[PDB]
Design a protein around this motif. Structure first.
Motif, PDB file in Angstrom:
ATOM      1  N   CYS A  30       0.823  -1.208   0.000  1.00 29.40           N
ATOM      2  CA  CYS A  30       0.000   0.000   0.000  1.00 29.40           C
ATOM      3  C   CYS A  30       0.857   1.258   0.000  1.00 29.40           C
ATOM      4  N   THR A  31       1.923   1.283   0.794  1.00 26.66           N
ATOM      5  CA  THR A  31       2.754   2.479   0.814  1.00 26.66           C
ATOM      6  C   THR A  31       3.297   2.784  -0.574  1.00 26.66           C
ATOM      7  N   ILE A  32       3.665   1.751  -1.327  1.00 27.44           N
ATOM      8  CA  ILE A  32       4.161   1.969  -2.683  1.00 27.44           C
ATOM      9  C   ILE A  32       3.028   2.383  -3.614  1.00 27.44           C
ATOM     10  N   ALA A  33       1.920   1.640  -3.593  1.00 31.44           N
ATOM     11  CA  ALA A  33       0.849   1.829  -4.564  1.00 31.44           C
ATOM     12  C   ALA A  33       0.080   3.128  -4.369  1.00 31.44           C
ATOM     13  N   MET A  34       0.079   3.674  -3.152  1.00 33.62           N
ATOM     14  CA  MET A  34      -0.680   4.888  -2.898  1.00 33.62           C
ATOM     15  C   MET A  34       0.007   6.133  -3.428  1.00 33.62           C
ATOM     16  N   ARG A  35       1.305   6.061  -3.723  1.00 32.53           N
ATOM     17  CA  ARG A  35       2.036   7.253  -4.139  1.00 32.53           C
ATOM     18  C   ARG A  35       1.397   7.916  -5.356  1.00 32.53           C
ATOM     19  N   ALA A  36       1.027   7.126  -6.372  1.00 30.58           N
ATOM     20  CA  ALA A  36       0.505   7.721  -7.599  1.00 30.58           C
ATOM     21  C   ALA A  36      -0.804   8.448  -7.357  1.00 30.58           C
ATOM     22  N   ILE A  37      -1.585   7.982  -6.380  1.00 28.82           N
ATOM     23  CA  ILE A  37      -2.825   8.654  -6.013  1.00 28.82           C
ATOM     24  C   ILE A  37      -2.518   9.926  -5.244  1.00 28.82           C
ATOM     25  N   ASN A  38      -1.674   9.817  -4.220  1.00 26.10           N
ATOM     26  CA  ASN A  38      -1.384  10.957  -3.367  1.00 26.10           C
ATOM     27  C   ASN A  38      -0.652  12.063  -4.106  1.00 26.10           C
ATOM     28  N   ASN A  39      -0.006  11.755  -5.227  1.00 25.97           N
ATOM     29  CA  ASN A  39       0.604  12.804  -6.034  1.00 25.97           C
ATOM     30  C   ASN A  39      -0.418  13.822  -6.512  1.00 25.97           C
ATOM     31  N   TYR A  40      -1.696  13.444  -6.567  1.00 24.54           N
ATOM     32  CA  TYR A  40      -2.782  14.309  -7.004  1.00 24.54           C
ATOM     33  C   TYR A  40      -3.597  14.840  -5.838  1.00 24.54           C
ATOM     34  N   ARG A  41      -3.084  14.720  -4.618  1.00 16.80           N
ATOM     35  CA  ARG A  41      -3.790  15.138  -3.422  1.00 16.80           C
ATOM     36  C   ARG A  41      -2.915  16.086  -2.611  1.00 16.80           C
ATOM     37  N   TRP A  42      -3.547  16.829  -1.704  1.00 22.79           N
ATOM     38  CA  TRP A  42      -2.823  17.690  -0.776  1.00 22.79           C
ATOM     39  C   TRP A  42      -2.743  17.117   0.635  1.00 22.79           C
ATOM     40  N   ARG A  43      -3.467  16.042   0.928  1.00 23.51           N
ATOM     41  CA  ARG A  43      -3.312  15.306   2.168  1.00 23.51           C
ATOM     42  C   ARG A  43      -3.331  13.831   1.817  1.00 23.51           C
ATOM     43  N   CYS A  44      -2.658  13.030   2.624  1.00 23.38           N
ATOM     44  CA  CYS A  44      -2.609  11.599   2.373  1.00 23.38           C
ATOM     45  C   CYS A  44      -4.034  11.037   2.366  1.00 23.38           C
ATOM     46  N   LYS A  45      -4.370  10.236   1.363  1.00 28.26           N
ATOM     47  CA  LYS A  45      -5.692   9.629   1.347  1.00 28.26           C
ATOM     48  C   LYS A  45      -5.826   8.677   2.531  1.00 28.26           C
ATOM     49  N   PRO A  46      -6.845   8.830   3.385  1.00 29.69           N
ATOM     50  CA  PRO A  46      -6.877   7.986   4.589  1.00 29.69           C
ATOM     51  C   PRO A  46      -7.060   6.498   4.354  1.00 29.69           C
ATOM     52  N   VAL A  47      -7.958   6.128   3.449  1.00 32.13           N
ATOM     53  CA  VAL A  47      -8.345   4.741   3.221  1.00 32.13           C
ATOM     54  C   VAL A  47      -8.524   4.533   1.726  1.00 32.13           C
ATOM     55  N   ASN A  48      -8.036   3.409   1.214  1.00 32.97           N
ATOM     56  CA  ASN A  48      -8.240   3.115  -0.191  1.00 32.97           C
ATOM     57  C   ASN A  48      -8.164   1.620  -0.419  1.00 32.97           C
ATOM     58  N   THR A  49      -9.096   1.093  -1.210  1.00 35.48           N
ATOM     59  CA  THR A  49      -9.116  -0.316  -1.572  1.00 35.48           C
ATOM     60  C   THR A  49      -8.714  -0.510  -3.021  1.00 35.48           C
ATOM     61  N   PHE A  50      -7.851  -1.491  -3.250  1.00 35.61           N
ATOM     62  CA  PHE A  50      -7.513  -1.936  -4.592  1.00 35.61           C
ATOM     63  C   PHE A  50      -8.147  -3.294  -4.854  1.00 35.61           C
ATOM     64  N   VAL A  51      -8.583  -3.507  -6.094  1.00 37.50           N
ATOM     65  CA  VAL A  51      -9.019  -4.814  -6.566  1.00 37.50           C
ATOM     66  C   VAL A  51      -7.941  -5.349  -7.494  1.00 37.50           C
ATOM     67  N   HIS A  52      -7.500  -6.574  -7.235  1.00 39.15           N
ATOM     68  CA  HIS A  52      -6.402  -7.203  -7.964  1.00 39.15           C
ATOM     69  C   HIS A  52      -6.982  -8.298  -8.843  1.00 39.15           C
ATOM     70  N   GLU A  53      -7.604  -7.890  -9.930  1.00 36.48           N
ATOM     71  CA  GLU A  53      -8.151  -8.816 -10.904  1.00 36.48           C
ATOM     72  C   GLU A  53      -7.913  -8.193 -12.262  1.00 36.48           C
ATOM     73  N   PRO A  54      -7.940  -8.990 -13.324  1.00 32.68           N
ATOM     74  CA  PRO A  54      -7.826  -8.414 -14.665  1.00 32.68           C
ATOM     75  C   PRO A  54      -8.893  -7.348 -14.877  1.00 32.68           C
ATOM     76  N   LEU A  55      -8.528  -6.319 -15.642  1.00 38.17           N
ATOM     77  CA  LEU A  55      -9.456  -5.228 -15.924  1.00 38.17           C
ATOM     78  C   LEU A  55     -10.783  -5.757 -16.435  1.00 38.17           C
TER      79      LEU A  55
END
Length: 134
Positions: A30-55
């Motif tokens: 999560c620490t790695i994967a959240m970077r691309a999201i937080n680059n577009y934010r001004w505060r760290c996103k508190p909670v986020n879910t990823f789905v790991h399945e083919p598109l």
């Protein structure tokens, strides 16, 4: 707010679909994967879910069990099967730009809102997920 350069469907995929995650088994995922999201934010996103399945499998939820959305609007759908997810939650001491997360792997049925694609979205996928139910 969603960055206006991304459509609703695109921002859903950016924030919530990881089909090429192999370090998802890592406690650092999560620490790695959240970077691309937080680059577009001004505060760290508190909670986020990823789905790991083919598109295609995530998109196909939009053709599955239709259910009322939590907002009572739009069209929501529950996945037939449980899917591999990761819940990411910001650690208590984190403060932008240092956003550290706990990674909690799991499996759950997902519920998504789907709608017709934006003109800026690929015509290959006419009806696409844009939000999680909650």
């Amino acid at each position: 707010m969603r960055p206006p350069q991304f459509t609703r469907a695109q921002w859903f995929a950016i924030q919530h679909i990881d089909s090429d995650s192999s370090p998802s088994s890592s406690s650092r995922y999560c620490t790695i994967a959240m970077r691309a999201i937080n680059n577009y934010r001004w505060r760290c996103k508190p909670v986020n879910t990823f789905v790991h399945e083919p598109l295609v499998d995530v998109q196909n939820v939009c053709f599955q069990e239709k259910v009322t959305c939590k907002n009572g609007q739009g069209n929501c759908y529950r996945s037939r099967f449980r899917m591999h997810i990761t819940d990411c939650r910001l650690t208590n001491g984190s403060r932008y730009p240092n956003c550290r997360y706990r990674t909690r792997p799991g499996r759950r049925h997902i519920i998504v809102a789907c709608e017709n694609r934006d003109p800026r979205d690929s015509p290959r996928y006419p009806y696409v997920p844009v939000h999680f139910d909650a």
